[PDB]
Amino acid sequence: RLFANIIEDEISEKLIVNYSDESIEDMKNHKTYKFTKLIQNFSHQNKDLFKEDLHVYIDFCLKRRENFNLFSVGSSNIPNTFEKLLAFFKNNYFDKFVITLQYVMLSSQDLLSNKLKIEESTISLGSTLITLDEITDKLKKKYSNGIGLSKFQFFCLQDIEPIPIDFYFIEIYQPSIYPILKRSSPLEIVLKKIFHDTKSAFVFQIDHSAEVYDILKLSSHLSFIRNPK
């Protein structure tokens, strides 16, 4: 599942956006890039991606109790994706789930403060844990060097003994990391555990940046990742 967040008024004429076909042709590199969905976005009227196809994706994994992820891949122009994600869960799930968050920068650094193990069922983080309702007006210090790794646990209120459904939100805004992602190193173990044991979805920021061509190339490799079997 590959989404292109098209910053339309900023992209070079060397990239040809085809909404009908959901494709981007790179006239510089003589290569065409296909996606699940192009999202038409603008620099001053900023869309919430969670009111589009992602909503359905998220909702489906939750109802099916399948562990899942979303990758946000971009550059220096950091989208508002993290804050809208928090807002989306507040508005839709607080009544069916107890939801926890742990948030780290990985290379580790705990982004919520005043251990990182691979297990069969989950990735265990030893950083600070909060429930999402603990986020109040008095709480800026976001990842926006390595990767941003958020782990949400959803404990369904309908269950007498809930197995948490894990959701991973992974922020990759450092061009250095694209090769590590492609190859999928400590990061490689994490990344490969996520691609193998959780359903995947990707959003790529397509804008002004000099990395846009590499972001596109990167999407081409990520387009081969399959559902955990």
Short mmCIF file of N, CA, C and O in Angstrom, two decimals, residues 80-151:
data_model
loop_
_atom_site.label_atom_id
_atom_site.label_comp_id
_atom_site.label_asym_id
_atom_site.label_seq_id
_atom_site.Cartn_x
_atom_site.Cartn_y
_atom_site.Cartn_z
N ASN A 80 2.68 17.26 8.97
CA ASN A 80 1.99 17.27 10.26
C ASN A 80 1.45 15.88 10.66
O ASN A 80 0.65 15.77 11.59
N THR A 81 1.89 14.84 9.95
CA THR A 81 1.37 13.49 10.09
C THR A 81 1.22 12.96 11.54
O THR A 81 0.17 12.43 11.89
N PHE A 82 2.25 13.14 12.38
CA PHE A 82 2.21 12.67 13.77
C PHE A 82 1.08 13.25 14.61
O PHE A 82 0.39 12.52 15.33
N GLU A 83 0.88 14.57 14.52
CA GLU A 83 -0.15 15.25 15.32
C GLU A 83 -1.57 14.88 14.89
O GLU A 83 -2.48 14.78 15.72
N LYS A 84 -1.75 14.69 13.58
CA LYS A 84 -3.05 14.30 13.02
C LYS A 84 -3.38 12.84 13.35
O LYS A 84 -4.54 12.48 13.59
N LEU A 85 -2.34 12.02 13.38
CA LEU A 85 -2.44 10.65 13.84
C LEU A 85 -2.98 10.59 15.28
O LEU A 85 -3.96 9.90 15.54
N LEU A 86 -2.34 11.32 16.20
CA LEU A 86 -2.86 11.42 17.57
C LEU A 86 -4.32 11.87 17.58
O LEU A 86 -5.14 11.25 18.24
N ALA A 87 -4.63 12.91 16.82
CA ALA A 87 -5.99 13.47 16.77
C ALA A 87 -6.99 12.45 16.21
O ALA A 87 -8.11 12.29 16.73
N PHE A 88 -6.58 11.76 15.15
CA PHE A 88 -7.40 10.69 14.57
C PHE A 88 -7.77 9.60 15.59
O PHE A 88 -8.92 9.16 15.62
N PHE A 89 -6.82 9.15 16.40
CA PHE A 89 -7.14 8.11 17.40
C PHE A 89 -8.04 8.63 18.51
O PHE A 89 -8.93 7.90 18.98
N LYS A 90 -7.79 9.87 18.94
CA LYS A 90 -8.67 10.58 19.88
C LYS A 90 -10.10 10.60 19.40
O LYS A 90 -11.01 10.29 20.16
N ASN A 91 -10.31 10.93 18.13
CA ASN A 91 -11.67 11.08 17.61
C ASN A 91 -12.39 9.79 17.25
O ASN A 91 -13.59 9.82 17.06
N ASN A 92 -11.68 8.67 17.16
CA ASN A 92 -12.31 7.45 16.64
C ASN A 92 -12.27 6.22 17.53
O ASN A 92 -13.16 5.36 17.45
N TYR A 93 -11.27 6.13 18.39
CA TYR A 93 -11.01 4.87 19.07
C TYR A 93 -11.02 4.89 20.61
O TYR A 93 -11.01 3.83 21.24
N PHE A 94 -11.05 6.08 21.21
CA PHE A 94 -10.95 6.20 22.67
C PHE A 94 -12.08 5.48 23.42
O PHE A 94 -11.96 5.23 24.61
N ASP A 95 -13.15 5.11 22.71
CA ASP A 95 -14.32 4.51 23.33
C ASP A 95 -14.34 2.98 23.16
O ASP A 95 -15.05 2.28 23.90
N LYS A 96 -13.57 2.47 22.21
CA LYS A 96 -13.44 1.02 22.02
C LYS A 96 -12.11 0.43 22.56
O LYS A 96 -11.99 -0.78 22.76
N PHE A 97 -11.11 1.29 22.79
CA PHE A 97 -9.77 0.79 23.13
C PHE A 97 -9.14 1.59 24.25
O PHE A 97 -9.40 2.78 24.38
N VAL A 98 -8.34 0.92 25.07
CA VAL A 98 -7.29 1.59 25.84
C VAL A 98 -6.04 1.55 24.94
O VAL A 98 -5.67 0.48 24.42
N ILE A 99 -5.42 2.71 24.72
CA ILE A 99 -4.33 2.83 23.76
C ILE A 99 -3.12 3.42 24.45
O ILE A 99 -3.22 4.47 25.08
N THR A 100 -1.99 2.73 24.33
CA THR A 100 -0.73 3.20 24.90
C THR A 100 0.19 3.70 23.79
O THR A 100 0.06 3.31 22.62
N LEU A 101 1.14 4.55 24.15
CA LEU A 101 2.15 4.99 23.22
C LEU A 101 3.54 4.89 23.84
O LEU A 101 3.73 5.17 25.01
N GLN A 102 4.50 4.43 23.05
CA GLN A 102 5.91 4.60 23.34
C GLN A 102 6.56 5.15 22.09
O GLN A 102 6.24 4.74 20.98
N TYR A 103 7.49 6.07 22.26
CA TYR A 103 8.03 6.83 21.14
C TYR A 103 9.54 6.98 21.26
O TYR A 103 10.04 7.65 22.16
N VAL A 104 10.28 6.38 20.33
CA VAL A 104 11.73 6.51 20.37
C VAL A 104 12.36 6.95 19.04
O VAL A 104 11.86 6.62 17.97
N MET A 105 13.47 7.67 19.13
CA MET A 105 14.39 7.79 18.00
C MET A 105 15.37 6.61 18.01
O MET A 105 16.04 6.36 19.00
N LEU A 106 15.44 5.87 16.91
CA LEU A 106 16.33 4.72 16.80
C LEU A 106 17.49 4.99 15.84
O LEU A 106 17.32 5.74 14.88
N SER A 107 18.65 4.36 16.09
CA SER A 107 19.84 4.49 15.22
C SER A 107 20.32 3.14 14.70
O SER A 107 21.21 3.07 13.84
N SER A 108 19.49 4.38 20.85
CA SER A 108 18.11 4.79 21.04
C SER A 108 17.99 6.03 21.93
O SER A 108 18.90 6.35 22.70
N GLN A 109 16.86 6.72 21.82
CA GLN A 109 16.56 7.90 22.61
C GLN A 109 15.05 7.97 22.89
O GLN A 109 14.24 7.97 21.97
N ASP A 110 14.68 8.02 24.17
CA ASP A 110 13.27 8.01 24.56
C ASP A 110 12.69 9.40 24.48
O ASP A 110 13.04 10.28 25.25
N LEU A 111 11.74 9.58 23.57
CA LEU A 111 11.18 10.90 23.29
C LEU A 111 10.06 11.33 24.24
O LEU A 111 9.56 12.45 24.12
N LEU A 112 9.68 10.45 25.17
CA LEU A 112 8.60 10.77 26.12
C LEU A 112 9.04 11.02 27.57
O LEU A 112 8.21 11.40 28.40
N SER A 113 10.32 10.83 27.88
CA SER A 113 10.81 10.93 29.27
C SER A 113 10.86 12.36 29.84
O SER A 113 10.86 13.34 29.10
N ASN A 114 10.93 12.43 31.18
CA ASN A 114 10.88 13.69 31.95
C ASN A 114 11.85 14.77 31.47
O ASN A 114 12.97 14.47 31.06
N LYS A 115 15.86 -0.41 26.35
CA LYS A 115 15.51 -1.80 26.04
C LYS A 115 14.80 -1.90 24.71
O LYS A 115 13.86 -1.15 24.43
N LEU A 116 15.24 -2.86 23.90
CA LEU A 116 14.70 -3.05 22.57
C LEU A 116 14.94 -4.51 22.18
O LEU A 116 16.04 -4.89 21.77
N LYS A 117 13.89 -5.33 22.31
CA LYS A 117 13.99 -6.77 22.06
C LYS A 117 13.04 -7.23 20.97
O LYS A 117 11.88 -6.82 20.93
N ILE A 118 13.53 -8.09 20.08
CA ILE A 118 12.66 -8.78 19.14
C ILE A 118 12.08 -10.03 19.81
O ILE A 118 12.83 -10.85 20.36
N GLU A 119 10.75 -10.15 19.81
CA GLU A 119 10.03 -11.36 20.26
C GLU A 119 9.10 -11.84 19.15
O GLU A 119 8.83 -11.11 18.20
N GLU A 120 8.62 -13.07 19.26
CA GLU A 120 7.82 -13.65 18.18
C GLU A 120 6.61 -12.76 17.83
O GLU A 120 6.34 -12.51 16.67
N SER A 121 5.93 -12.27 18.86
CA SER A 121 4.62 -11.62 18.72
C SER A 121 4.68 -10.09 18.61
O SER A 121 3.70 -9.46 18.21
N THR A 122 5.84 -9.51 18.96
CA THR A 122 5.94 -8.08 19.22
C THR A 122 7.40 -7.64 19.26
O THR A 122 8.32 -8.46 19.35
N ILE A 123 7.58 -6.32 19.17
CA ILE A 123 8.83 -5.67 19.47
C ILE A 123 8.66 -5.01 20.82
O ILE A 123 7.74 -4.21 21.05
N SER A 124 9.54 -5.35 21.74
CA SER A 124 9.42 -4.84 23.08
C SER A 124 10.33 -3.63 23.23
O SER A 124 11.52 -3.70 22.93
N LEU A 125 9.73 -2.51 23.63
CA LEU A 125 10.44 -1.26 23.91
C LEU A 125 10.41 -1.04 25.41
O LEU A 125 9.39 -1.30 26.08
N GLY A 126 11.52 -0.54 25.94
CA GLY A 126 11.60 -0.33 27.37
C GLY A 126 11.50 1.12 27.71
O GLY A 126 11.80 1.52 28.84
N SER A 127 11.10 1.94 26.75
CA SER A 127 10.98 3.36 26.99
C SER A 127 9.66 3.71 27.68
O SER A 127 8.77 2.88 27.78
N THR A 128 9.55 4.96 28.12
CA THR A 128 8.37 5.52 28.77
C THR A 128 7.05 5.20 28.03
O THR A 128 6.93 5.39 26.81
N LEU A 129 6.06 4.74 28.79
CA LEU A 129 4.76 4.41 28.21
C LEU A 129 3.72 5.36 28.77
O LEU A 129 3.71 5.63 29.96
N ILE A 130 2.88 5.90 27.90
CA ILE A 130 1.73 6.68 28.32
C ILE A 130 0.48 6.10 27.67
O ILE A 130 0.56 5.37 26.68
N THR A 131 -0.68 6.41 28.24
CA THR A 131 -1.93 6.22 27.51
C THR A 131 -2.21 7.51 26.78
O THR A 131 -1.85 8.58 27.26
N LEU A 132 -2.84 7.42 25.63
CA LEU A 132 -3.05 8.60 24.81
C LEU A 132 -3.84 9.73 25.48
O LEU A 132 -3.63 10.91 25.15
N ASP A 133 -4.75 9.40 26.39
CA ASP A 133 -5.49 10.46 27.10
C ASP A 133 -4.60 11.25 28.07
O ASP A 133 -5.01 12.28 28.59
N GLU A 134 -3.37 10.79 28.29
CA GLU A 134 -2.42 11.55 29.09
C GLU A 134 -1.87 12.76 28.33
O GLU A 134 -1.28 13.65 28.93
N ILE A 135 -2.05 12.78 27.01
CA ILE A 135 -1.66 13.96 26.22
C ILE A 135 -2.69 15.07 26.43
O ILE A 135 -3.87 14.93 26.07
N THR A 136 -2.22 16.16 27.04
CA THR A 136 -3.03 17.34 27.35
C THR A 136 -2.28 18.58 26.85
O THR A 136 -1.12 18.48 26.44
N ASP A 137 -2.94 19.74 26.89
CA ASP A 137 -2.36 21.01 26.40
C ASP A 137 -0.94 21.29 26.93
O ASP A 137 -0.16 21.99 26.28
N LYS A 138 -0.61 20.72 28.09
CA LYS A 138 0.72 20.86 28.70
C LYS A 138 1.69 19.72 28.32
O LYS A 138 2.33 19.12 29.19
N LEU A 139 1.81 19.46 27.01
CA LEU A 139 2.70 18.42 26.47
C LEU A 139 2.84 18.56 24.95
O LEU A 139 3.38 17.68 24.26
N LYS A 140 5.41 19.27 20.56
CA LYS A 140 6.61 20.10 20.66
C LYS A 140 7.90 19.27 20.61
O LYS A 140 8.69 19.42 19.68
N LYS A 141 8.09 18.39 21.59
CA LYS A 141 9.34 17.62 21.74
C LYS A 141 9.45 16.43 20.77
O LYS A 141 10.19 15.47 21.03
N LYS A 142 8.74 16.51 19.64
CA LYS A 142 8.66 15.42 18.66
C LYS A 142 9.99 15.09 17.95
O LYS A 142 10.98 15.81 18.11
N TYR A 143 10.01 13.98 17.20
CA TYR A 143 11.18 13.56 16.38
C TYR A 143 11.57 14.59 15.30
O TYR A 143 12.76 14.80 15.05
N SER A 144 10.56 15.21 14.69
CA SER A 144 10.76 16.30 13.71
C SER A 144 11.79 17.37 14.12
O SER A 144 11.94 17.69 15.31
N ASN A 145 18.36 11.93 11.72
CA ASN A 145 19.40 11.37 12.58
C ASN A 145 19.33 9.84 12.64
O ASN A 145 20.35 9.15 12.51
N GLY A 146 18.13 9.32 12.85
CA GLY A 146 17.86 7.89 12.73
C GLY A 146 16.45 7.70 12.17
O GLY A 146 16.09 8.29 11.15
N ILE A 147 15.66 6.86 12.83
CA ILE A 147 14.23 6.78 12.51
C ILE A 147 13.37 7.13 13.72
O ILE A 147 13.80 6.96 14.86
N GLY A 148 12.18 7.65 13.45
CA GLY A 148 11.16 7.85 14.48
C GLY A 148 10.36 6.56 14.56
O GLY A 148 9.87 6.07 13.55
N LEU A 149 10.27 5.99 15.75
CA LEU A 149 9.54 4.74 15.94
C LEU A 149 8.55 4.94 17.09
O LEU A 149 8.96 5.15 18.24
N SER A 150 7.27 4.93 16.74
CA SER A 150 6.18 5.00 17.71
C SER A 150 5.52 3.63 17.76
O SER A 150 5.23 3.03 16.72
N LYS A 151 5.28 3.12 18.96
CA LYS A 151 4.54 1.88 19.11
C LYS A 151 3.27 2.14 19.90
O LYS A 151 3.33 2.59 21.05
#
